[PDB]
């Protein structure tokens, strides 16, 4: 074998402790750059003029933040969707003021995480597996694309991308509610059904398999020792599990087929989260939640408030207060 042939054999080797592969050739450097920049920025970055109004917001630990308040702050509204790599700045000091780290991080991250998804297909192929784990990962990935790329595109600025920080995330959520009434949007509602249901079914499946473990141990040892890695025989009794759950509800509401059950476990959260991602990605173009403001009117024409109108009052509070020095004109159009 020549050098290229050998290199290819190593890259695609099924024997590396962590699989590299061709997607990994892009994933490794991009994820390392994003990680390193993030860590350094989160600790040490100076304040960033997120809203382009010369009002710098401090995100880093050394500049007065704790783990909860800290963030890498989105790039300046003055930049908008302009590409702002380090070399476009006159200095690192300028780059930092304008939120250059945010762009470097999210672009390397999105590239790296897309390659992470490809890499999941890639290894499944090398191991002779079925290929669709990567399709499940497309759900959180799509969600990351929605908040870091698609929303900024629709609104015309990376300053409206989700901040890389715990409190910045909450800021993004509250402002999103004000501007899109996301709670009243059916795609976010499907998302909630996806994650509440995902958690429910996770607990359900956990509890049912755990409930029907076949006795292989004594009381002075963990029942976990009753299963040995790679054993051929199933470790629980699915017939007893189905016997239980089918009586809890009724026979035909319970799965007796493990393949069907596990498919449902994959599908429910993944589809819901795809809708969550699509909610963000379509509210990115301002097709917003249901608006029933003043929908109910009496015989004279008096407005009779519903809970929708109370939501509206909360939303107004968010709207009027957010970015309190950034608006000069009466309508918030992006």
């Amino acid at each position: 074998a020549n050098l290229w042939e050998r290199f290819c054999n190593w890259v695609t080797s099924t024997d590396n402790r962590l699989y590299v592969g061709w997607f990994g050739v892009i994933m490794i450097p991009t994820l390392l750059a994003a990680t390193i920049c993030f860590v350094i920025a989160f600790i040490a970055a100076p304040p960033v003029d997120i809203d382009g109004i010369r009002e710098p917001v401090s995100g880093s630990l050394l500049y007065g933040n704790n783990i909860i308040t800290g963030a890498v702050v989105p790039s300046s509204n003055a930049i908008g969707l302009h590409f702002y790599p380090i070399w476009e700045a006159a200095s690192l000091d300028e780059w930092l003021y304008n939120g250059g780290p945010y762009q470097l991080i999210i672009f390397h991250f999105l590239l790296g995480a897309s390659c992470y998804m490809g890499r999941q297909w890639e290894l499944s192929y090398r191991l002779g597996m079925r290929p669709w784990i990567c399709v499940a990962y497309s759900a959180p990935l799509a969600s990351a694309f929605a908040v870091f790329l698609i929303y900024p595109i629709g609104q015309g600025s990376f300053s409206d991308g989700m901040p890389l920080g715990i409190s910045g995330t909450f800021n993004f959520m509250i402002v999103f509610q004000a501007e899109h009434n996301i709670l009243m949007h059916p795609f976010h509602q499907l998302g909630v059904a996806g994650v509440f249901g995902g958690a429910l079914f996770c607990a359900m499946h956990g509890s049912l398999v755990t409930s029907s473990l076949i006795r292989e141990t004594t009381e002075t040892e963990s029942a976990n020792y009753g299963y040995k890695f790679g054993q051929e025989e199933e470790t629980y009794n699915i017939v007893a599990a189905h016997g239980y759950f089918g009586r809890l509800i009724f026979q035909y509401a319970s799965f007796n087929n493990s393949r069907s059950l596990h498919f449902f476990l994959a599908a429910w959260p993944v589809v819901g989260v795809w809708f969550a991602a699509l909610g963000i990605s379509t509210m990115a173009f301002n097709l917003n939640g249901f608006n029933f403001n003043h929908s109910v009117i009496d015989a004279k024409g008096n407005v009779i408030n519903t809970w929708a109108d109370i939501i509206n009052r909360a939303n107004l509070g968010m709207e009027v207060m957010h970015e309190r020095n950034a608006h000069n004109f009466p309508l918030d159009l992006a």
């Binding site: 003055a78 079925r130 009434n181 949007h185 795809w274 173009f285 301002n286 992006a334």
Partner: protein, 451 residues
């Protein structure tokens, strides 16, 4: 009934169309019948739009997406995009609707009556997915067809009345394109432009000369490529790079359509040339700029000196500099300074927005347009209540730009998913493990431990 249950086909009802992979006749029917559905919708939706259409309201106040496509081609409209004749819309709708019956007829025939496979019937129409030469030949036919389609657009623009030109001197109007851009430096230059702000890759195309010239190129490229693929078979390197199966080819096309979907989303969101704001409403960037313009006009009429007016932050309230110094509108719309539109451009000088032009040259038609666009911003609820999320019920409006961007993002996204699903499946099926791991030949069991 051949292959029409799970036992014989290996595919459950919910994967029923996979039963068609190797039945070229029935599969032709599926495809032709489906092309029928697309043509049916195009026709029926147009007639529906026309029946609901009030000529003196803007199209974008009327939930129209198809009439705007016809109007952009220069049919049925005059100066400013005003509707002068609805008959071209009627023709487009009827002719599609009639054509769909024909396609539906052929589809139904092939699907349930005609020969199930075409190979024994004809060597020309029959095909084996794994026959690389036959695959590239059929691909070749379709590329020629597509090239002719692109030249049909060129024909309309140059020889059959022209296209609607929002940029036309003295105001938007239908205009014949006599000098299409042929220079490959300009045409392919778009393809190498950054997709980021102020650049916008192909989405930045801003004049009909470039649009028409692009389609001349694309028409010729597609016909040349089609001939190429009829006359050649795939080279060795291509043979070793791809999976050669029906499902693989589907996956490649799903990937391509996904890409196109996202591009179309950005096209309708930002571009106001091939999506004239007269027909589709203002872009998000456009309406935000139009707001700044509106209040600059209002306050300047009241006596404000808008050049020297310092806002609360220290930046100009109405006017400020972009990061490269151009004079731009201020407030949040600073992000939208790359916006360009016929109503704004007359105020633009070498250095950006010109203060002397602003002070002296703003015409009533500009005030009207800015007010119109500001109050038809592409924001609205799912139940079509126009405006911000906290707005009260009153205005029944969601911009066609929002409808078209959101729908196409959703479609493009699910098509990326379909690409991954089918590409991963095509690989596994080709290698022979799509149904699971062979218990007596589990690959991992022959591999050394990781530790």
């Amino acid at each position: 009934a051949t292959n029409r249950d799970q036992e014989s086909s290996g595919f459950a009802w919910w994967a029923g169309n996979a039963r068609l992979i190797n039945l070229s006749g029935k599969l032709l029917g599926a495809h032709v019948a489906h092309a029928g559905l697309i043509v049916f919708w195009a026709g029926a939706m147009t007639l529906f739009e026309l029946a609901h259409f009030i000529p003196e309201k803007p199209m974008y106040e009327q939930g129209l997406i198809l009439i705007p496509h016809i109007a952009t081609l220069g049919w049925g409209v005059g100066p400013g995009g005003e509707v002068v004749d609805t008959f071209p819309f009627f023709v487009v709708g009827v002719v599609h609707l009639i054509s769909s019956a024909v396609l539906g007829f052929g589809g139904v025939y092939h699907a349930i009556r005609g020969p199930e496979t075409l190979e024994e019937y004809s060597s020309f129409f029959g095909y084996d997915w794994k026959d690389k030469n036959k695959m590239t030949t059929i691909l070749g036919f379709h590329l020629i067809v597509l090239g002719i389609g692109a030249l049909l657009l060129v024909a309309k623009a140059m020889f059959f009345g022209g296209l609607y030109d929002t940029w036309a001197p003295g105001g938007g109007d239908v205009r014949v394109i006599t000098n299409p851009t042929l220079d490959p430096r300009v045409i392919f230059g778009y393809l190498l432009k950054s997709p980021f702000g102020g650049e916008g890759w192909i989405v930045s195309v801003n004049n009909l000369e470039d649009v028409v010239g692009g389609h001349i190129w694309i028409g010729l490229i597609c016909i040349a490529g089609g001939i190429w693929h009829i006359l050649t078979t795939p080279f060795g390197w291509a043979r070793r790079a791809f999976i050669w199966s029906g499902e693989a080819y589907l996956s490649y096309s799903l990937g391509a359509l996904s890409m196109m979907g996202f591009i179309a989303t950005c096209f309708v969101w930002f571009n106001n040339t091939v999506y004239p704001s007269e027909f589709y409403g203002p872009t998000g960037p456009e309406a935000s700029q139009a707001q700044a313009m509106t209040f600059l006009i209002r306050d300047q009429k009241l006596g404000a000196n808008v050049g020297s007016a310092q806002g609360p932050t220290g930046l100009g309230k109405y006017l400020m500099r972009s990061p490269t110094g151009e004079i731009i509108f201020g407030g949040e719309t600073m992000r939208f300074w790359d916006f360009r539109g016929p109503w704004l451009e007359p105020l633009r000088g070498p250095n950006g927005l010109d203060l002397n032009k602003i002070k002296n040259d703003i015409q009533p038609w500009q005030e009207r347009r800015a007010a119109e666009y500001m109050t038809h911003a592409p924001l609205g609820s799912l139940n079509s209540v126009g405006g911000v999320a906290t707005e009260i019920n009153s205005v029944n409006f969601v911009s066609p730009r929002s409808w078209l961007a959101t729908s196409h993002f959703v479609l493009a996204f699910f098509f990326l998913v379909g690409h991954l699903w089918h590409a991963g499946r095509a690989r596994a099926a080709a290698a022979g493990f799509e149904k699971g791991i062979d218990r007596e030949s589990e690959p991992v069991l022959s591999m050394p431990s990781l530790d």
